[PDB]
Amino acid sequence: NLPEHWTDMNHQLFCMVQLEPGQSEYNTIKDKFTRTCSSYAIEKIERIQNAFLWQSYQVKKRQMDIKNDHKNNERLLFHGTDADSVPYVNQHGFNRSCNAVSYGKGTYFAVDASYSAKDTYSKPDSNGRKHMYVVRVLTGVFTKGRAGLVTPPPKNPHNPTDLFDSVTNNTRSPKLFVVFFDNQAYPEYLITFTA
Amino acid sequence: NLPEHWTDMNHQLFCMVQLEPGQSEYNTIKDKFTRTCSSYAIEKIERIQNAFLWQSYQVKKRQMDIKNDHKNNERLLFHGTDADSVPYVNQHGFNRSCAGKNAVSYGKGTYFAVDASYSAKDTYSKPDSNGRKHMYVVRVLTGVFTKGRAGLVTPPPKNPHNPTDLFDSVTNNTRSPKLFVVFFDNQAYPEYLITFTA
Ligand SMILES: O=C1N=NC(=O)c2cc(OCC3CCCCC3)ccc21
């Protein structure tokens, strides 16, 4: 059930597709980044076409839409990483088992590209290049996190196994989200850029 | 995609079904257990019907069936646990983030035993305040495996020059496997819960 805007993959199940500058899709992703990172230079934007990761993510989306009884469970967020982690994320997505983790032992995503653009996250490589993903994240129903969580808290400790979907730094005005399960986040675009 | 022999759950996403001694379904699990645990006695065997865990696991199985040549990717293995963990495993499955360090570590992941006698150790199936021990019977996507190492947080690569193309699982011994370790969510479906006593 591969999305229409994906380009043909000659019957393969993984491809990184470089976007054409000045076309609709590239302009949309560039604008999301330049909202907070207009001082940075974009070398390229690639679309991640990973059929298996997409399948597993879409199953978790359909389940969360049923569980929560509404369809507003997805946000587009940013994730900076080092060059040596890019092949793993492209093929396998995000892994909590692989910086501060003050809101719990999960994978962190930023609302603002400027946060992910810090050298501690998007570490410049031996050529000065920095790497940041644009990510579809199933944030669903969220609560404030805290140090040492291995899953989100329960919604009511009367039923300890009915969990929040994610945690955040601030519930009224979130700037980051943490997810604790595989296939709750789909890396959709990779931005390669310089300071 | 829910199996046609499951009980009708009437819109519900989750149910535990108590099996009847003398049914083939009960007897096969009883025999699999008693092969190595004939000193213990079974109280009851429950079929775990968890729609979401089943969906996510069957998607992973179809993907491993495509990726691997013509491999039998699935084994039926045992997992002992404490009573405090049973409600979470029934609803959410096996979380590597909650796993203990094993007395012989082949990596940081969830451990599954070939023999019920391994899982029947008090270290894993801790007796509760009523002297009941709990063991799951689990469908596990072992796939293509190699001998593990204590340092691992994912299975190792098949080829050191292609670090992202990974083994599916690791074992203690490739020639005579007695334990498997998996490192990803929805690679194991808790199928039956055995409640047993001395
Ligand atoms: O883009 C990111 N890539 N990798 C991260 O680990 C990461 C982490 C992150 O917030 C970490 C949080 C910040 C406030 C204090 C506690 C810790 C935000 C973005 C990122």
Curated annotation (Swiss-Prot), chain A:
It is found in: Nucleus. It comes from the Eukaryota. Changing G80A: Slightly reduces catalytic activity. Abolishes activity. Disulfide bonds: none annotated. Its main location: nucleus. GO terms for biological process: negative regulation of gene expression; negative regulation of transcription by RNA polymerase II; protein poly-ADP-ribosylation. This is Protein mono-ADP-ribosyltransferase PARP15. The lineage of its organism: Eukaryota, Metazoa, Chordata, Craniata, Vertebrata. The chain holds residues 481 to 678 of 678 of the full protein.
Swiss-Prot record, chain B:
GO terms for molecular function: NAD+ binding; NAD+ poly-ADP-ribosyltransferase activity; NAD+-protein mono-ADP-ribosyltransferase activity; NAD+-protein-aspartate ADP-ribosyltransferase activity; NAD+-protein-glutamate ADP-ribosyltransferase activity; nucleotidyltransferase activity; transcription corepressor activity. GO terms for cellular component: cytoplasm; nucleus. GO terms for biological process: negative regulation of gene expression; negative regulation of transcription by RNA polymerase II; protein poly-ADP-ribosylation. Disulfide bonds: none annotated. Its main location: nucleus. It is found in: Nucleus. Keywords: Glycosyltransferase, NAD, Nucleotidyltransferase, Nucleus, Repeat, Transcription, Transcription regulation, Transferase. Residues 2-198 form the PARP catalytic domain. Mono-ADP-ribosyltransferase that mediates mono-ADP-ribosylation of target proteins. Acts as a negative regulator of transcription. Belongs to the ARTD/PARP family. This is Protein mono-ADP-ribosyltransferase PARP15. It comes from Homo sapiens.
